[PDB]
Amino acid sequence: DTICIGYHANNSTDTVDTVLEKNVTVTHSVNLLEDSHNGKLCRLKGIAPLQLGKCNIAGWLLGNPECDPLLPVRSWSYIVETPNSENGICYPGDFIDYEELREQLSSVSSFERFEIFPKESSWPNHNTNGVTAACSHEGKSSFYRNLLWLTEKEGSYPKLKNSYVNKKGKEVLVLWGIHHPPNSKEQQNLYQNENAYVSVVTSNYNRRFTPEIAERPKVRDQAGRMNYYWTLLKPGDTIIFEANGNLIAPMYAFALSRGFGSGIITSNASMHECNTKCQTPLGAINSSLPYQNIHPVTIGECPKYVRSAKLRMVTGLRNIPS
Amino acid sequence: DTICIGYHANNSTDTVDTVLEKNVTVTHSVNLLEDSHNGKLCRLKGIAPLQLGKCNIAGWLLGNPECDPLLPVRSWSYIVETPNSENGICYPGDFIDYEELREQLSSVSSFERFEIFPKESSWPNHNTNGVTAACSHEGKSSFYRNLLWLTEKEGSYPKLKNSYVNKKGKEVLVLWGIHHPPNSKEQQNLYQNENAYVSVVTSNYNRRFTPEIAERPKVRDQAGRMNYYWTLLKPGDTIIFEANGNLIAPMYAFALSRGFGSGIITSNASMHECNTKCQTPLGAINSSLPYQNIHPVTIGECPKYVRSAKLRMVTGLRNIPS
Amino acid sequence: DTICIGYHANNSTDTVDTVLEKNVTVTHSVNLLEDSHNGKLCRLKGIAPLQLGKCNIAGWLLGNPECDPLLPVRSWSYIVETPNSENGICYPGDFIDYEELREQLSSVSSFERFEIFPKESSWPNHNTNGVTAACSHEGKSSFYRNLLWLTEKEGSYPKLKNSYVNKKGKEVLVLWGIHHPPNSKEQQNLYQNENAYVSVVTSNYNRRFTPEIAERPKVRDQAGRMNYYWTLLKPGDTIIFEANGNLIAPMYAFALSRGFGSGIITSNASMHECNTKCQTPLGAINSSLPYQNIHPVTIGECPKYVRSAKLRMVTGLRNIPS
Amino acid sequence: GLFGAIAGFIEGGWTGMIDGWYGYHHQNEQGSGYAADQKSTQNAINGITNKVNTVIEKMNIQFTAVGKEFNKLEKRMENLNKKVDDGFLDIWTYNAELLVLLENERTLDFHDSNVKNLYEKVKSQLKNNAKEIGNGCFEFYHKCDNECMESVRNGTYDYPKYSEESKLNRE
Amino acid sequence: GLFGAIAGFIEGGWTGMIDGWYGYHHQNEQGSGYAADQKSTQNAINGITNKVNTVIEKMNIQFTAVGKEFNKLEKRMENLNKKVDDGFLDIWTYNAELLVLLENERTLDFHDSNVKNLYEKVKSQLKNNAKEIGNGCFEFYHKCDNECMESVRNGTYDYPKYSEESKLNRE
Amino acid sequence: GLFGAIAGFIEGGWTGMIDGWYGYHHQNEQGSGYAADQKSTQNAINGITNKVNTVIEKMNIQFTAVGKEFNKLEKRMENLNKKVDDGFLDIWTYNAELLVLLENERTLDFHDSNVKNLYEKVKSQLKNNAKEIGNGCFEFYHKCDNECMESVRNGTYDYPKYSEESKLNRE
Numbered sequence A, B, C: 001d002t003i004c005i006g007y008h009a010n011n012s013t014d015t016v017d018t019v020l021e022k023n024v025t026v027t028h029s030v031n032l033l034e035d036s037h038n039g040k041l042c043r044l045k046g047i048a049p050l051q052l053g054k055c056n057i058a059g060w061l062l063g064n065p066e067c068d069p070l071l072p073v074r075s076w077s078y079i080v081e082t083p084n085s086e087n088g089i090c091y092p093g094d095f096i097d098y099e100e101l102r103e104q105l106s107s108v109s110s111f112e113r114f115e116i117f118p119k120e121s122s123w124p125n126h127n128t129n130g131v132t133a134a135c136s137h138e139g140k141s142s143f144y145r146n147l148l149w150l151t152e153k154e155g156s157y158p159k160l161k162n163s164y165v166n167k168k169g170k171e172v173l174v175l176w177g178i179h180h181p182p183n184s185k186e187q188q189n190l191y192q193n194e195n196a197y198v199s200v201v202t203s204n205y206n207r208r209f210t211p212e213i214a215e216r217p218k219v220r221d222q223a224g225r226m227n228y229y230w231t232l233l234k235p236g237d238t239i240i241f242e243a244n245g246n247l248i249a250p251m252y253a254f255a256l257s258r259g260f261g262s263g264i265i266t267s268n269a270s271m272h273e274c275n276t277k278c279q280t281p282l283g284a285i286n287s288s289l290p291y292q293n294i295h296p297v298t299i300g301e302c303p304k305y306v307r308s309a310k311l312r313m314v315t316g317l318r319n320i321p322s
Numbered sequence D, E, F: 001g002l003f004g005a006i007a008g009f010i011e012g013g014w015t016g017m018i019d020g021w022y023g024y025h026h027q028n029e030q031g032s033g034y035a036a037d038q039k040s041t042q043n044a045i046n047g048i049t050n051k052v053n054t055v056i057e058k059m060n061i062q063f064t065a066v067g068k069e070f071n072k073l074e075k076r077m078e079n080l081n082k083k084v085d086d087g088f089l090d091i092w093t094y095n096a097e098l099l100v101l102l103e104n105e106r107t108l109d110f111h112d113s114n115v116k117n118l119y120e121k122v123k124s125q126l127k128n129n130a131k132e133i134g135n136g137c138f139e140f141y142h143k144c145d146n147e148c149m150e151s152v153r154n155g156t157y158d159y160p161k162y163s164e165e166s167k168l169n170r171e
């Protein structure tokens, strides 16, 4: 009579690597590296993202007419920009602190688009019909939906001084613009004042703008420029504009709400009726594995991104079924 | 006759974790995680810290009257600010490069407060009694101890041009201010010049300041503003001020010395007659352990901060006293 | 008859450290820490570096006369500055965004020095012979090789407006300067206009410069200043200068090419006829070891820098030859 | 292996033992058969489950981490952010791969140790009532029925019960 | 354990052996008693002291490290500094916990190895002059007084001195 | 050692065995001599070569990494860049030194294990035809010529061929 001591073997072809040996066939193992995604843009914990479509951050906040208008009140879990965002800043100019504005929006979870300065009520004795061809819509010349080009009325540009008190209970993002004609003749024809100025003041913001006239190369068939500025009016604070020309006045501001875990991503995938706890620009990840080699840009509760192509931990024995 | 081979056991209840097993009772172990502190602010290697009390960095450097005046010459190992620093910038305005100034002070180990421009000697034909209610002291209106509000004297504000040569052998922090009235009437009543300017020049610093007049919301019952600027005059260099109005002139500068291992912390603990090699905002650490889970902000020679709740290394055997 | 089982021993004195024991004499081992270098500056993958000699980045780009002129077209793998670079900014002033310019040059692999504005063709009715003693050469007063000091001609400084179209197919670094006299008398004597201005515009760059006059401390026996500015004209874009005084006009621009793996280092070693895949400020590294304790600044394919003094991995047994 | 059992003096594994990692194969007059050792198998399962769960837990939840944008005059800050991201990625890839390799080596050694310990336990139970015929097997010097095989498998082998017969057959 | 001695064929520990980690318990006509083995105990103490000191030394002195402040227009730089701090903290917590776990496992295995090595040394010294009665014990086939016990404990056991008596009692 | 062979019951090494890490020394009427065991030596060489190559490969190629410059009003950014560089350097020095120490310990234990496995293999081959005279040696109870020594060294020892003579000499 005999008795033997042995160990398990099966038809497992799983291979793991050790420090002393590579490609060790084992009976049981566990994959720690997640490489699978659905290739879709899904909701993040029940909240759909904010898709800007043809627009980017600048074009959406300024109100580019070429982009489909969004609902007045929106809420999202993350922002999505398309790689070929052709509609953004339509009139040539510089967006001051645009990256800081994107970083601020990265923690925003909701906006309410309201009329801070009504068009036919806020700027008397001034023309509010100024449009341009660089911001065309349906072939015709147009202008931003959230801004208003104030020009001379009846050969006179009286000094305007308006203000808004923030009674929304939240931060109010306010955007405006400063125009710079290429020559002084256009300056007189548009604002009737060669020594014009703009002043924007709050309780913590204070800036003065002076037009700078010079011939500039044609960008979008425009020799003049238009610098865009923004600020975050705190709850209860008052913002005051005072100008005698060159002021691209605000018309629609944004009532913002702060959140956590949000961010801005550039994705090419489409939105589907799905939900996930982890979103990448390539697709959603439904996994509890610790690692993933899909994309370094992650939104939500995701595995740690690594460059590895294989992360498998052996749980069984050395498979020797011979 | 028999002889056996065995191992040690005791009444030790110490438990450690392994990769294969948790909560292993062992005979001997060593705790590597320091979780104990004295809850006091102590000296760091024999040098007491600099406690600003009711003031912050801005209020202490500008000379807010609400804070108890410090000794003329001081030396410290680290700076402490209270969480509820109500006394800082008392006249509404912007402190330009204030965070960079804090970062510069983070490596400073000593200061000597000296009178760079005497009050009754530096600014003839100008009034030096300007005070405000936003910087009140003992109920009465007052102003910064290190600055001087120059106004019009006898209906005229002559162009002042003064200078200081640094013969202190060290860097000299010099602070000044620029006032911005809300209207031009106050501008004429205070400085008699509507086109005023300020100029501050050294061998490496050069800046010009122009007043910007506009009605602004009331901050501390003040519609005007006061922007604060600073510079570090190098040894042997000369600083020159040239102004015809709106200049909040310097009166006391700081002779600074550079050191190592210092920093600025926000703490709620009190100063005690004690000494340590490691200081945290929660208290001092007297330990040689490699890790600590007390606070990530450390001053001096401290253990590495980790989020862990337990770091115990076994030195004995598996305790089996049965 | 007997047979024994044993292990290898030799006359090896190699010692390694373990977790349980230090200084273990072993039969075979491998050194992973590279500590050897040749102490020379060599080519990097067949491309020689760019040695600025007596000049730094600022002095080389502005065209300091004290430095030997380089060839019109140059290509390099990395930039070398000497620790005692005495020739740089010779006329006292501020180099705006100089560190960003260095960071831009860090990815440049080639330059072509061409005449963007010919001296005797670009600025009519203006004097182009302005020199200074702060930028002396061979004892005589001189000026930058790449800039031109435009002054008044025949008692009049007409408004100049010139431009350059980039047809080089690459980025064009263009540098210019703005002069600030200490008094208005010199301003009138040099530019005949007290209210002068400069304007530099491209398709993405737009800046206006106004002279600021004030008495300043003597730096290199000069009370005035000269601020230096730069821009990167994109291929196909046009740069336009428009000034009525104080414009230190450009004369030579740089046609730049982009590359990878380059950088700027400060070294004291000399250039030798040698080639390497790894370059440090102390010398070249010819090794395949994973680590090195030579220098943290590396150019090319180098081992990872560590502070360790010894990194030896045992491959043999515990050497017991007794 | 590190303990010389798996792929050592026990050359191969048993595909017929599907109930556990370690066990026995017996052969007597009543027949032959496999039987997994549930104690050592369960202890190994517990240890390796704890190891895997520990490796998974030590990696915290990666929350939202996106890229940032910088204008043309912020190249230094852009390169600094890129250096931070690349260094963190290098460190984490290094840690993950190294930990996986180390734990794989240790798990193989752990299985080897368990097999060797089971064999040595059976050997110390059997003593000279059975001879080591190699390949991790024992040939009894006495008749060992299913009851005796079960007393061997659960650690209650009666040595004096078969000592006389084993000494007689050993001669 | 990894070597099957601690919590293995030696079931429990000895509270009566206070002088060291490993040792012996003897019983003869002169009486019984414990005695720690000072050589293996001292070597283990040296090794574990070196291990602990190494783990402590590899962590350099954490010098002054405080937070920084940023204005409302420097949110990107603030988030970059926060990301740097959080990544370093994650990495260091991970390293500390992982190293502690690995070294604890290795220390337990080291003690197991030391106990097994001591037992095997005693066994190879005794040879067939004593029988393995399990539980890490040996029953002598001869009279072993305190001098013989000491010659066993220090590695100078005289096998031919008791070979004849052990063969007679072994029969 | 962890397995008690190197610097254990085999006290020292053999300088006369230059052909490998592990082997044998034989002595019979035909003479004496060393002979390295090529199988275990080659397997150890493969394993340690893989270990060294793995440690070298896990460290990626360090590409260009130079310092940056900052003006007098960018002290926070300068300190942030310095903190990033110093933290990465600390982490990498820590990882390198710790990995070297761990792998050195494991390599010593691996050699110990290989030596012990070779000794146990020879012992299980020889059985009672030879006696363990300690120091990792076996004294045969029969005449073992060079052919018998070679059959011992390559794992084809014929036990019944010398069983009768070994039993006669063992008496």
Ligand SMILES: *[C@@H]1O[C@H](CO)[C@@H](O[C@@H]2O[C@H](CO)[C@@H](O[C@@H]3O[C@H](CO)[C@@H](O)[C@H](O)[C@@H]3O)[C@H](O)[C@H]2NC(C)=O)[C@H](O)[C@H]1NC(C)=O
Binding pocket: A013, A015, A023, A025
């Ligand atoms: C990792 O290990 C596995 C298993 O050892 C390797 O898979 C095997 O690769 C060999 C080639 O080296 C295959 O062998 C060939 O098989 C055919 C079958 O008809 C035979 O005709 C040839 O003469 C030759 O023997 C083997 O089939 C294959 N087995 C499996 C299950 O895939 C694998 O290649 C190793 N990977 C690496 C990267 O080393």
Ligand SMILES: *[C@@H]1O[C@H](CO)[C@@H](O[C@@H]2O[C@H](CO)[C@@H](O[C@@H]3O[C@H](CO)[C@@H](O)[C@H](O)[C@@H]3O)[C@H](O)[C@H]2NC(C)=O)[C@H](O)[C@H]1NC(C)=O
Binding pocket: B013, B015, B023, B025
């Ligand atoms: C880590 O291990 C220790 C020791 O094994 C655990 O402590 C023990 O916990 C058990 C409960 O699981 C306690 O048992 C109870 O004891 C009372 C005493 O009268 C008895 O009446 C109950 O029937 C039950 O057996 C045990 O006393 C306690 N011992 C000590 C020394 O604390 C500990 O809970 C473990 N920790 C974790 C997190 O697993």
Ligand SMILES: *[C@@H]1O[C@H](CO)[C@@H](O[C@@H]2O[C@H](CO)[C@@H](O[C@@H]3O[C@H](CO)[C@@H](O)[C@H](O)[C@@H]3O)[C@H](O)[C@H]2NC(C)=O)[C@H](O)[C@H]1NC(C)=O
Binding pocket: C013, C015, C023, C025
């Ligand atoms: C690491 O280990 C090596 C080898 O054990 C150490 O080297 C040795 O150091 C000892 C001193 O502790 C030297 O001993 C002296 O040797 C002279 C020779 O004439 C003798 O006269 C003295 O009485 C004393 O024994 C020994 O020669 C030397 N051997 C070698 C090969 O260097 C080394 O010091 C150790 N390093 C550390 C940091 O512990």
Ligand SMILES: *[C@@H]1O[C@H](CO)[C@@H](O[C@@H]2O[C@H](CO)[C@@H](O)[C@H](O)[C@H]2NC(C)=O)[C@H](O)[C@H]1NC(C)=O
Binding pocket: D146, D147, D148, D149, D150, D151, D152, D154, D155, D156
């Ligand atoms: C180990 O196996 C043996 C079988 O060989 C078990 O012993 C017998 O147990 C059954 C049921 O309890 C009794 O009917 C027999 O009379 C027992 N035989 C002898 C010879 O005692 C034993 O109980 C098992 N041990 C454990 C812990 O399960």
Ligand SMILES: *[C@@H]1O[C@H](CO)[C@@H](O[C@@H]2O[C@H](CO)[C@@H](O)[C@H](O)[C@H]2NC(C)=O)[C@H](O)[C@H]1NC(C)=O
Binding pocket: E146, E147, E148, E149, E150, E151, E152, E154, E155, E156
């Ligand atoms: C190990 O223990 C033995 C005791 O059994 C020691 O031997 C004896 O040593 C004493 C003192 O040196 C003598 O008086 C006895 O005559 C010795 N007895 C025999 C039988 O020789 C021995 O010295 C110890 N070994 C070591 C290294 O300490």
Ligand SMILES: *[C@@H]1O[C@H](CO)[C@@H](O[C@@H]2O[C@H](CO)[C@@H](O)[C@H](O)[C@H]2NC(C)=O)[C@H](O)[C@H]1NC(C)=O
Binding pocket: F146, F147, F148, F149, F150, F151, F152, F154, F155, F156
């Ligand atoms: C192991 O060594 C033995 C020598 O002891 C080898 O056996 C002999 O092989 C030679 C050549 O094949 C023959 O001429 C002898 O007649 C053999 N002797 C016996 C007793 O069979 C054996 O081949 C070796 N094994 C391996 C795998 O190399």
Ligand SMILES: O=C(c1ccc(Cl)cc1Cl)N1CCO[C@@H](c2ccccc2)C1
Binding pocket: A008, A028, A029, A030, A315, A316, D018, D019, D020, D021, D044, D045, D046, D048, D049, D052, D053
């Ligand atoms: O490998 C595993 C495993 C997988 C994942 C984890 Cl987290 C832990 C483990 Cl232990 N197993 C789980 C239990 O079953 C074991 C088995 C052994 C022999 C025969 C059949 C099944 C195999």
Ligand SMILES: O=C(c1ccc(Cl)cc1Cl)N1CCO[C@@H](c2ccccc2)C1
Binding pocket: B008, B028, B029, B030, B315, B316, E018, E019, E020, E021, E044, E045, E046, E048, E049, E052, E053
């Ligand atoms: O665990 C330790 C220890 C603690 C800290 C360090 Cl840094 C190193 C070590 Cl080795 N010990 C120190 C020496 O005494 C040992 C002992 C063993 C058995 C009985 C009584 C005491 C126990």
Ligand SMILES: O=C(c1ccc(Cl)cc1Cl)N1CCO[C@@H](c2ccccc2)C1
Binding pocket: C008, C028, C029, C030, C315, C316, F018, F019, F020, F021, F044, F045, F046, F048, F049, F052, F053
């Ligand atoms: O240590 C090594 C070694 C070095 C570097 C690497 Cl990457 C791998 C290894 Cl294995 N050796 C290489 C082969 O030869 C071995 C030897 C053993 C005994 C006697 C003479 C030579 C010794």
Ligand SMILES: *[C@@H]1O[C@H](CO)[C@@H](O)[C@H](O)[C@H]1NC(C)=O
Binding pocket: A011
């Ligand atoms: C492999 O094993 C699995 C699980 O027992 C079984 O379902 C499958 O049919 C097997 N395949 C082969 C080819 O053996």
Ligand SMILES: *[C@@H]1O[C@H](CO)[C@@H](O)[C@H](O)[C@H]1NC(C)=O
Binding pocket: A275, A286, A287
């Ligand atoms: C996600 O994966 C789990 C298993 O890991 C599965 O049960 C579930 O259906 C998947 N989908 C969703 C939406 O959870």
Ligand SMILES: *[C@@H]1O[C@H](CO)[C@@H](O)[C@H](O)[C@H]1NC(C)=O
Binding pocket: B011
């Ligand atoms: C535990 O052991 C210590 C040290 O020997 C002793 O002082 C203490 O009294 C013991 N306590 C108990 C409850 O055994």
Ligand SMILES: *[C@@H]1O[C@H](CO)[C@@H](O)[C@H](O)[C@H]1NC(C)=O
Binding pocket: B275, B286, B287
């Ligand atoms: C600090 O701790 C040590 C022991 O670690 C102790 O001796 C000392 O009294 C404590 N206090 C001071 C001030 O060192």
Ligand SMILES: *[C@@H]1O[C@H](CO)[C@@H](O)[C@H](O)[C@H]1NC(C)=O
Binding pocket: C011
């Ligand atoms: C040491 O060994 C090497 C290699 O065998 C040999 O060349 C050298 O002469 C030896 N030196 C001594 C002093 O033994």
Ligand SMILES: *[C@@H]1O[C@H](CO)[C@@H](O)[C@H](O)[C@H]1NC(C)=O
Binding pocket: C275, C286, C287
């Ligand atoms: C560099 O080192 C290698 C060996 O590592 C050597 O063959 C070569 O000659 C050295 N020099 C060059 C220029 O490669």
